[PDB]
Amino acid sequence: KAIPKDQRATTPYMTKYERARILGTRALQISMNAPVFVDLEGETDPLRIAMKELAEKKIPLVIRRYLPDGSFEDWSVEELIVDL
Amino acid sequence: IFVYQNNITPSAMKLVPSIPPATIETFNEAALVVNITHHELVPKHIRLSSDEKRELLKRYRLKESQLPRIQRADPVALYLGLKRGEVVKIIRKSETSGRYASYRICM
Amino acid sequence: LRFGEMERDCMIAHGAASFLKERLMEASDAFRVHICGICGLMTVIAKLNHNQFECKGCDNKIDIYQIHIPYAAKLLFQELMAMNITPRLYTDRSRDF
Amino acid sequence: LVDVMTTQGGLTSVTRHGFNRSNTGALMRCSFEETVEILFEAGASAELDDCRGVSENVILGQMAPIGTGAFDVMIDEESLVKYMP
Amino acid sequence: MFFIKDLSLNITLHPSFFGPRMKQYLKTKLLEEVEGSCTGKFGYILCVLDYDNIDIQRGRILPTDGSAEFNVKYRAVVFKPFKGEVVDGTVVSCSQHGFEVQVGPMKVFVTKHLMPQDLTFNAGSNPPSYQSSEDVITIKSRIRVKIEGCISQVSSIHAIGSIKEDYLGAI
Amino acid sequence: RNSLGNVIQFIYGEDGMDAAHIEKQSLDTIGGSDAAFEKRYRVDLLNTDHTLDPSLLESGSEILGDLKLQVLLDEEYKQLVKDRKFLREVFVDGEANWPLPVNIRRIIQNAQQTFHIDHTKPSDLTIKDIVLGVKDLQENLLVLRGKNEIIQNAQRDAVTLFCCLLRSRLATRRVLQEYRLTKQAFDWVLSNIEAQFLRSVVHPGEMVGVLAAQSIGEPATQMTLNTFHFAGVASKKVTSGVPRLKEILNVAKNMKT
Amino acid sequence: VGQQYSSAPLRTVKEVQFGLFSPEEVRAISVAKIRFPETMDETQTRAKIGGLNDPRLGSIDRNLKCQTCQEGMNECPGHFGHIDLAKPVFHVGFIAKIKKVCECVCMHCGKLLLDEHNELMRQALAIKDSKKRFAAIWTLCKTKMVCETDVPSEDDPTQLVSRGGCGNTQPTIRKDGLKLVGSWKDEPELRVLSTEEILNIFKHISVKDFTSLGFNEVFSRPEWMILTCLPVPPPPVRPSISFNESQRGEDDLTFKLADILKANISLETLEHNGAPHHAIEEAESLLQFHVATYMDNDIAGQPQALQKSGRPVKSIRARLKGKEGRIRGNLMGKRVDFSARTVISGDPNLELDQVGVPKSIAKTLTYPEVVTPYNIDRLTQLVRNGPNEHPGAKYVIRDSGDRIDLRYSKRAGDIQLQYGWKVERHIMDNDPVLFNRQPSLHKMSMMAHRVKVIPYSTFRLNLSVTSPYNADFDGDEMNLHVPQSEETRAELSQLCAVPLQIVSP
Amino acid sequence: STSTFQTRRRRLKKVEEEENAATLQLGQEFQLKQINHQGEEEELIALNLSEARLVIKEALVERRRAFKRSQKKTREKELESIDVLLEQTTGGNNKDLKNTMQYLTNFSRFRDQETVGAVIQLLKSTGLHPFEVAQLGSLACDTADEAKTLIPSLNNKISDDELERILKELSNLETLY
Ligand SMILES: [Mg+2]
Ligand SMILES: [Zn+2]
Ligand SMILES: [Zn+2]
Ligand SMILES: [Zn+2]
């Protein structure tokens, strides 16, 4: 249904399932020969690269969180607080 | 509220739903002898105004049906005389977290 | 090797959404098929060269889709049609919720 | 478990005669004790399946809304720009 | 009769083109798979307007491959004739069976039998033509037809028309 | 919820905590005589025999008397109290040990030797520091988030049983005379708890249904069968074991016992 | 999957709209006139008759042909053919309802037996749930056994109002075998309910009457529980089995159909020749029998419809029936590729998260990697290394979607890899794997592990990870599945990893 | 394909596809009441030759400009000036657009975005349906009979006399060559 950046309600944190898919999803793309927005300090593993792409929060993705009723809340990996 | 003793004539009862709006109920004596709602296990329910509900829903993105239900003939459903639609707010004690809200629509 | 119900329930428990889809498709059955955007069936006559498509009856050519479902599923669905039952497969939801 | 049994109204058993008759879509119930029977009285009453239940997907080999699949992911082209020196 | 219908479309993109100027490649790929297409449903997709404000929205990553997919909503000018529409165009081909006139991107044929009586066909001519007590219709002459029927075909839409009625013919 | 949309807990486990982060901590508040309870959490700044001996707090002697603090110092007490009652109305058994996120017994043991605190020299905490902080702490152990009442109310609930342990532990009389914490240590202990808690929450995804299921059947499988330890005393025979569990899940009318 | 690109757009299934086949569609969909019951032998000539299985449907003999559709064998879901029945039949499974329905409607004019007028009714006509709004309406009509012509309205029980006519008494009904019999009363009148009639009635049931009863105006009218045109499933459903040439072994299903077909003909031929009036219904039951025993064969009406040799027969239903069958046996649990299994033992020298795989397996299991500048060097290296030296590979694949059997292919040693190609390589130290022991009823029965290629043929694990699997080294076989994507191996790494599992929920 | 802003819930039985004609009955995709991307309601967009010519040009032109913002890092006379614009922003194999531009550029009736303006402002006071306002805008007409015959969807929808005052002021605005 769409939810404004405001009136936001979900967790401010990142569900492990979220991270893991992102991480996976990214690495996949990296190995798909995709642009990598960080200095590979000499990394050759798409995951490892993704993990870096993440600890510098430079991953162009937005998790769209869907709610039982259909409406969703979009959260970027830039925002999402990565504790774990 | 009508309180019979041994029973009512099946010829009689079929006259209650013949004068709306007004509503009628029927309890046996041996029934009311003890107030169940005082029972260790039964926790307090509560009726909710047709607004506190239109809210509960809104605030939970709930479709009427997705809500836990209570039997029209449920002991406590009677003790508070609910109607097809009214919602009750069962508030119990929890070993996980002292209190624990919960709700129940009425089918 | 058999990746059975039990090993299934276990993945679901873990939350490994895709490592599951895999074990089930990309690692076993997996098959592609052409559905009609109208009578949600395995009808459609796919001549994967001249692109020609058709689904006379629900008489199509235009509205056509392609999907990914284990072979078993293709089978099942047919087996059912075999038993006069029609399991329509749609790609867009109309009921909402 | 308990909460599952109750809710509905009274005591919904954990058996073919109970929970597997609920407002849950076909295929999902289809996947337990009554299989063919179920399906029959499904296409009979023109059932319609959400395809929201694990089983629903595992049977169509799709990614089921579950942890990893409890959400969609996307590329914000706008944040994709600001990511280049 | 030409139209401006609002449309959309889906484009699967590879992680490859996931650059800083992705938007670009899209609008591009759009125009590649759009302009010059045909559908008995929409007619001839001729041109995409407002190239600048093409809505891409956010695109979603797929699940097995990182390809993304956006639903690009746009707007273009179209054209799809109708069985009753009166258009005029320039003739192109001609034969013993009647000539073919071209109106817009589409070619509307005309059976020798669907035109007037007093209009015989001349072959010993060059270029070939149809002669009348006072009219003469050959290759370059401009005619005004009355589309009597349409026919959708792969990537085109031909039609049969006439000039038997009144106010129809050469100009 | 389930594949439909039907709720089945408006909060997993009625507390939104993930099983992984929980242990048997004790509710000191419940057990014990009305006598000792006072000798522990009771602080009276207006009394030679019921005030914090300055050998503990830095601003100890310049407190004995302040009437503005005995307003807080008391707001605290009337609470650990209101608590005691609440609990005994829940855990009637008297049982004080329960499964609760954030092990606070340890979180402090760490705070202890991590700053090499010495049981000789006095603290440096304002009594305002303690109470007014432990109060802000709970303000952040958010489990639910909503911007409205309904929810912000359910929050206070899913949090309750915990705080009680919290306050039970972060008692002004406790904090100083029991474990010599310092502004630092304290402020630390508060930091971790806010987190260790926040981490203890459950992740919106976790297929609990199946998890739940598994966890009952696992042990279900190991259950002995048709044993009856009573046999040898017929007439005092009762149905116990797997046949019983069968009986349940089945929702059987004619139960053996 | 399925190889060969297709303009067709790729989507997912969102809804599953179960319905019932209207004879009209059955024909519509159908491509085979399916007249003859024979299989092939165009008088022995090997091929297929434009009769049963392929009068256009799918094929066999490794021949594209499938109505030009070509694509042959793999990449072509059979197509449905039809087979017009001579006289309508019951649907083994639907007999149940077909009956109950009648009990819910009087014949002749075919209409409900309780309008808005009878009050007990209303209370039913409101329950939204076609599943109970039915077993309710029925509970209220199995009793009414007279199509009332007039009933007292909402006013005086003295004034009578009329609705639908004809009160022709309704007959009570009982299920005998596969037919429906009802009685009329004063000394009953027992006559069999001809399908030809039932159908009619149903056909005459109203739109609002459908709906009111658990039905649907578009996908499932009751009139469709009675079979009129039988959909004939194509080959891939009832595949044969060839012992080279001149030796063919067909499928059970193909046989029933045959018998159904045979039976059908022998019936038709009886209505266009010496028709001994009631000597026909003696073979109409045979049709019904086969047309019924084909879908189901485990009924109460004893006759198991055996097939010479005492072999029961495999009813379509018999295939889906749980455990070992279609739904629970092929879908909820599949056998899978990239799986391994051997005896296990204890290694006090591995890390907890590790699992010592023996070389033998590493060299057999392959993780399809993607050729990328990050790897090209190291990758090609393997390729060269062949599929026999450990650190190696055993297939390379080009964008053209084609395999390169590194163990043969003349250009084995050759090959210059390419950005965008893939190299199914050997599992190497540290690849994330899904280790596990059965039976699985614990999250901790399947945990990811760090691979660690080793000698000797036994999977190696760390003692302290014995209990989670609850295994002993008394010859305990364990399994192992290998991830395949990059995202997949990530779901095992970031979620199912042994160390992530140390605290049990 | 290329979806068209309206998801008509097709329930299996797809049979009703009415005819198409000058009974102003155009396919579903072209009712006067169609939906805009923003999600509002908007009248059908009927373009008359020359009116289309301009519209396409406009876009083709302004596309060029934006096509270079990113590169930094008289009858027979228009045929040529255009071919270039195309050999500039078009895909090249858009043979369709080409032929269209000629037709469009040869049969048009208005050069100025101003005369075309008056045309519109004039016709859009007839309340006629877009497809008439279109045909009426790109088809020479002297008598009403001539118009009302070629465009039958009129007939009764407007007195003969008035349609004639409309055709009288069309010939006048009819730009010269
Ligand atoms: Mg053993
Ligand atoms: Zn179709
Ligand atoms: Zn084929
Ligand atoms: Zn009747």
Numbering used by the authors:
A (entry chain F): 72 to 155
B (entry chain E): 109 to 215
C (entry chain B): 1128 to 1224
D (entry chain A): 1371 to 1455
E (entry chain G): 1 to 171
F (entry chain A): 857 to 1113
G (entry chain A): 2 to 186, 195 to 514
H (entry chain D): 4 to 76, 118 to 221
What does the original paper state about this entry?
The macromolecular assembly required to initiate transcription of protein-coding genes, known as the Pre-Initiation Complex (PIC), consists of multiple protein complexes and is approximately 3.5 MDa in size. At the heart of this assembly is the Mediator complex, which helps regulate PIC activity and interacts with the RNA polymerase II (pol II) enzyme. At 1.2 MDa, Mediator represents a major component within the human PIC and based upon biochemical assays, Mediator helps assemble and stabilize the PIC. We have assembled the complete, 1.9 MDa human Mediator–pol II–TFIIF complex from purified components and have characterized its structural organization using cryo-electron microscopy and single-particle reconstruction techniques.
Importantly, separation of free VP16-Mediator images from Mediator–pol II–TFIIF significantly improved the resolution of the Mediator–pol II–TFIIF reconstruction from 48 Å to 36 Å, based upon the FSC criterion (or 26 Å using the 3σ criterion). We began by docking a crystal structure of yeast pol II into the cryo-EM density map using the program Situs. Docking pol II with Situs represents a rigorous, unbiased way in which to probe pol II orientation, and regardless of where the pol II crystal structure was initially positioned (e.g. outside the cryo-EM map or within the leg domain or within the head domain), Situs calculated the same docking result. Rigid body docking of the pol II atomic model indicated a best fit within the Mediator head region, as expected based on comparison of the structure with that of Mediator alone. The orientation of the pol II cleft in this docking model is perpendicular to the long axis of Mediator such that downstream DNA would extend from the “top” of the assembly. As an alternate means of determining the orientation of pol II within the Mediator–pol II–TFIIF assembly, we used a projection matching strategy in which 2D projections of the human pol II cryo-EM structure were aligned and cross-correlated with 2D projections of the human Mediator-pol II-TFIIF assembly. This independent analysis resulted in the same pol II orientation within the Mediator–pol II–TFIIF assembly as that calculated by docking of the yeast pol II crystal structure. The pol II orientation calculated from these alternate methods indicated the pol II cleft was exposed at one end of the assembly. Pol II surfaces required for interacting with TFIIB, TFIIE, and promoter DNA (i.e., the pol II cleft) are exposed within the Mediator–pol II–TFIIF structure; RNA exit is unhindered along the RPB4/7 subunits; upstream and downstream DNA is accessible for binding additional factors; and no major structural re-organization is necessary to accommodate the large, multi-subunit TFIIH or TFIID complexes. Within the Mediator–pol II–TFIIF assembly, the RPB4/7 stalk is oriented such that the nascent RNA could extend unobstructed from the PIC.
